[PDB]
Write a protein that binds this ligand. Structure first.
Ligand SMILES: Cc1ncc(COP(=O)(O)O)c(CN)c1O
Ligand SMILES: Cc1ncc(COP(=O)(O)O)c(CN)c1O
Ligand SMILES: N[C@@H](CCC(=O)O)C(=O)O
Ligand SMILES: N[C@@H](CCC(=O)O)C(=O)O
Lengths: 404, 402
């Protein structure tokens, strides 16, 4: 009848909205090029799928420990040691139904009403809303495509207040594909250390989707940052396990125990089947081994195809991504254009709608990520689909003019 | 250094004791585990094969947030065929287990300061989910001599302008009580008078029901459809606990809010599990012969425990009409002192007594809002239950009743 004010004012995830719009259009017989959700074209690796199948076959279908099965949490600690140089005990790991839930629980457990959550823009669409679910206050810090959308520490200093409680860092980034260098992280950490109440939420789900010579640095590995950092990772992106629903949190014992307690009242311990598939995934070796190296090579090739293709287009500004499977494309020079049969294109929403309604390409408008000057394309899908999309994007813009 | 709501949040005592027992068994200490309400049946063969086929066929991608279309239409068919309810597929939201379904429902409709009415004994998570919404749980006690069923007078006595949600769990966890249609009807007439008061109807144990008892969906009563949120799922009926799959059905506007919320919380339920769910609903009305065998087994175990534990001096038992739990009144022994343990004067010290000294894990009633009882799950083998009964008798023997 009359929804709670928090849920009433909650913004829908535009990523979910557009993806489900595209899926529904396709299913009703309208072909749509789907570049919204970051969903790999690859199958789950054979050995991972076999582990899940074997779990079902051997009756591994009962409730697990809330925090996750012992074998998985131990494998996760081995991963964090070997890949990230971090030391956790198995009771500092909380396994959830994907990283989105891992993130939400972390926010809810450490943020009190009125606490400020500091979020660099462009940001993954759910960070601001999860903060509002906690009665917290999002503090967005804009970044510049000229600075590869990386947080400027001076801007961080200028936004700190007594109410500052949580800084969210996403690297490699969704939507920009930026990778934070160690040097910049070390500077940010020095700011964090001077403020006793300040925690860092480090979202590292795209860790293995990284292109040489970029390298990934876990924020929790920096000086004084271990006791301050909640580390969220998962299986969706690296191992093409999006439909399995499996992610995890690692951090200080007292915070992980509060998240676990919260998870005990909001869900039971992730799927028993997915957790077994998870230990097979981690069994693949350091950084997912050659299984993941093959997927990364493919993503890197799709990346290069897109940067070349769209980059050449008049007015288009691109930050060449260093990780993840997203291009955050600046088409803002086209804003103000009048497209025949459609109308005014003056922001990312109307541009994305134009691409979708007239050329059947589904992308996510930058405004959902806190930056209206850009559009997000996922290149997790096939090269064939990406080539088709580029031809249509070219056609789509041929009628409009780029400002100078 | 934690949020006030998570700081004060009570841990699920069912989850705590269950995990405790499993760990003990791992350290090499045998425990009779009667805590978690978990079927000993395998996932049914056709259901498991559907999950296997889903994986083999590459159905390992993100689904529609609200749930795959095939599952949501199958759920609507089931709600019509079994419960007499008419929902459209976009009135269904599929989640990672029913636990999540109840939470999102509570968060969506309860504003701060709103009151959530919860008949005691209650399933442990209802009060805590209410507090996550900044709502106030209003608990209405019930009595074993009344089969732990709500008194309509007591309900109407507790209503305020702030009453927003009433939670009806039938068949009940922890009591196994089943709400008769006539009681439900009288509750409805009280409800149909307060325009803010919604009903959350948790029907997860609907198929675990013992004749001549029968399940009545609250949403089927006159004028209640528009105010009822129906929560159900697969874990109890189809023994799919390991799978995490549940759903909510309700008014389009509330379901849309829950889906919007889930889109920020967890996204869609697993693709694999939803495929298995389609197969489970494919077994036919009430799960067909597959579920019939399960119910028959549970009824047998129930009858064994009720008879065994019943003739113990100072043990009182409401014989359950559904679910897989016994809510047993051992309070005649409160005030006893056991040599080697100490004073036993509430459900927590008695449950701890049973576990520490006799290695039987049960969940104390205090977690369910009623300290006079202890909950036993009997979704395990007859041989395990025989052992539990001997150990319980032996534990009670040194003690004295009334
Ligand atoms: C940065 C970020 N964090 C977390 C998630 C959630 O992923 P999932 O719930 O599928 O594990 C996503 C989804 N792509 C993401 O991009
Ligand atoms: C009354 C009730 N509702 C919901 C649940 C949650 O079940 P699940 O999340 O596994 O579907 C349970 C678990 N037995 C329950 O007892
Ligand atoms: N932002 C991701 C997924 C968002 C989500 O999980 O809701 C796409 O691609
Ligand atoms: N209390 C239910 C399970 C749900 C829970 O763990 O809280 C039985 O067992």
């Amino acid at each position: 009848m009359s929804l709670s004010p928090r849920v009433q004012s909650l913004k829908p995830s535009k990523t979910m909205v557009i993806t489900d719009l595209a899926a529904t259009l396709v299913q009703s017989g309208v072909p749509v090029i789907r570049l919204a959700a970051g969903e790999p074209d690859f199958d789950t690796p054979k050995v991972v799928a076999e582990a899940g199948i074997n779990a079902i076959r051997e009756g591994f279908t009962r409730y697990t420990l809330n925090a996750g099965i012992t074998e998985l949490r131990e494998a996760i600690c081995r991963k964090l040691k070997e890949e990230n140089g971090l030391s956790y005990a198995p009771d500092q790991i909380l396994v959830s139904n994907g990283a989105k839930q891992s993130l939400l629980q972390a926010v809810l457990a450490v943020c009190s009403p009125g606490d400020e959550v500091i979020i660099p823009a462009p940001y993954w669409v759910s960070y601001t809303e999860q903060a509002r679910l906690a009665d917290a206050t999002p503090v967005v810090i804009p970044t510049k495509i000229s600075n590869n959308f990386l947080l400027d520490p001076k801007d961080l200093e200028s936004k700190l207040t007594e109410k500052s409680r949580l800084l969210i860092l996403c690297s490699p980034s969704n939507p920009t594909g930026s990778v934070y260098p160690k040097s910049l992280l070390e500077e940010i950490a020095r700011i964090i250390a001077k403020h006793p109440r300040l925690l860092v939420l480090s979202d590292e789900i795209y860790e293995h989707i990284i292109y040489a010579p970029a390298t990934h640095t876990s924020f929790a590995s920096l000086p004084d940052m271990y006791e301050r950092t909640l580390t969220v990772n998962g299986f969706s992106a690296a191992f093409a396990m999006t439909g399995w629903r499996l992610g995890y949190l690692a951090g200080p014992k007292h915070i992980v125990a509060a998240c676990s307690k919260l998870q005990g009242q909001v869900s039971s311990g992730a799927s028993s089947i997915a957790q077994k598939a998870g230990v097979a995934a981690l069994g693949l070796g350091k950084a997912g081994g050659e299984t993941v190296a093959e997927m990364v090579k493919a993503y890197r090739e799709r990346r290069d195809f897109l940067v070349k293709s769209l980059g050449d287009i008049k007015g288009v500004k691109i930050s060449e991504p260093q990780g993840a499977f997203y291009l955050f494309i600046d088409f803002s020079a086209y804003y103000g254009s009048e497209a025949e049969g459609f109308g005014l294109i003056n922001d990312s929403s109307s541009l994305a709608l134009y691409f979708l309604d007239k050329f059947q390409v589904a992308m996510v408008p930058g405004d959902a990520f806190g930056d209206d000057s850009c559009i997000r394309i996922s290149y997790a899908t096939s090269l064939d689909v990406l080539q088709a999309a580029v031809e249509k994007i070219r056609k789509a813009l041929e009628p409009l003019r780029a400002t100078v």
